[PDB]
Amino acid sequence: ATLSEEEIAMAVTAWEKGLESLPPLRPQQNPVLPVAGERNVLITSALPYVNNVPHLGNIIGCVLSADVFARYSRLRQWNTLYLCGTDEYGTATETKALEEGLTPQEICDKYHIIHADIYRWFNISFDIFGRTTTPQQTKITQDIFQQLLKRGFVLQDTVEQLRCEHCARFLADRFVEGVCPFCGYEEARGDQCDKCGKLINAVELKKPQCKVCRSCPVVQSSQHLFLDLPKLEKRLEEWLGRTLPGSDWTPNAQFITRSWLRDGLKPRCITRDLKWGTPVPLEGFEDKVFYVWFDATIGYLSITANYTDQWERWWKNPEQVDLYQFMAKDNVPFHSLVFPCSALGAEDNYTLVSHLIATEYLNYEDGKFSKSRGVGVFGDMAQDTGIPADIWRFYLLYIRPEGQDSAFSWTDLLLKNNSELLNNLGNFINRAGMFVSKFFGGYVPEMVLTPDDQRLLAHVTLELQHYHQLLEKVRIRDALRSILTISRHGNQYIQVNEPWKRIKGSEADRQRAGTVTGLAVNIAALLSVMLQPYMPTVSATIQAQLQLPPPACSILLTNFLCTLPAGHQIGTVSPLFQKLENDQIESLRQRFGGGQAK
Ligand code: MET
């Protein structure tokens, strides 16, 4: 805990320079567009499937992780566009719509609102939260398809598929029964005979049956399109070899990507026999659509396009734009292989991802989230617990599954709330603001820095730079702890100086009390901005209580500044956090535990 004289003297200088170090801000732009010469940060979160209510695992892995970095990116004055939206096409949407007695468009409109409401409550600051079911999706999907077709990256072949003429549909291996051509087992599945173990193709079945209507399916050759990834594999590895090293792709994402390439890429079918999907502009495909995962990633582009005319300045400008993509592990192959191949094969100067951020999975307690069994906290339930959104944000981010899986624990939430928020972070900021309001009439006291004060000030600056160091590489988990480290330093500073005692003392002792008090609240002011990407409501609350000027609230410099000079008037202070009670938590834990199921 010992620095250099140069370190201490440098940090002090930057501090004393004050609010004059602050570039008067730039007016907010709508739409946000890339600005030449400056850093332009494009951020996408994986588009959640619309017809499933998201749980805390989904949220922390994608929208919440992306939001933290998005908010940090704005504090660094980077031109930031954070976009997301609902993934809506697919067979599951047709199955769920029918089950709910609605049209696919109806059930999508319904659940899109549910998603948006959940993300609003969690305070996810999307610049756009769009939809994949738009005319612009069809247009952009078809264009990219056309660019790939004429360059010979699309194959066309026929597939023998069992079709039930009564159900008027092609059958999945799990919907077809039949007798085994290898052992004669009369009730074999289309995928496997459980009797002799043989892995089969459904068409090999004798006397096939549709397990829905029990009719006899007939073999039909249907036309299908394919993306020739083997022909695109070369240019994909050239791009990967150019961009992976020195990047901040999460280790798991890199491994998965290189792992798929080690096997070798295969031709992927990009068409489906469906009605709900982006239509294929080709002869004889009037009743087929693009496969969801072929154009779901194109949704990123179409969502941006519904937002602005100049969407190609973001998505076709790799020289000015650094793309960050946040997703879960299972989404990586589509973002690191499928879409890059499609984009590179289209040869339209596309912005490709620079840093892929893929998290491990968040477990609920000792198991997994399950709407089926009533286990776990889902996004629509979190609003009803009496626990504020920022408390959810803090804890989920404190245990964000980066290197390995993590598990949500009600017991741990209570401990971390009471220890880190109440008895640490909140305690420091409460005392800081309280001392100004009580001892100095709400005016920040004069600050006469001792050598020990300069050390603290320099230590705070180093933690701030460490904080920057981490969040610059999307180390969200560790930067949060950096915040708590500064706060823990501040509590020690207050405790040893005992300003609330010294204030009732000699001429000299009252000056020390004021210096400590003033420096403390300037640290509090800094903490509020650092906390902004994590707990935006509390951040604003602190800034309201301290009346921190809007320009100081909008930027985070790499140096600890004096944002509250001597004579600055603060507002009215009030305890930041509430204690979490044991009875309160046991009740919530029993509610989401599964033992109260139906
Ligand atoms: C274009 S990202 C789509 C991700 C998909 N909706 C999922 O939840 O896995």
Ligand SMILES: [Zn+2]
């Ligand atoms: Zn068999």
Ligand SMILES: [Zn+2]
């Ligand atoms: Zn049938």
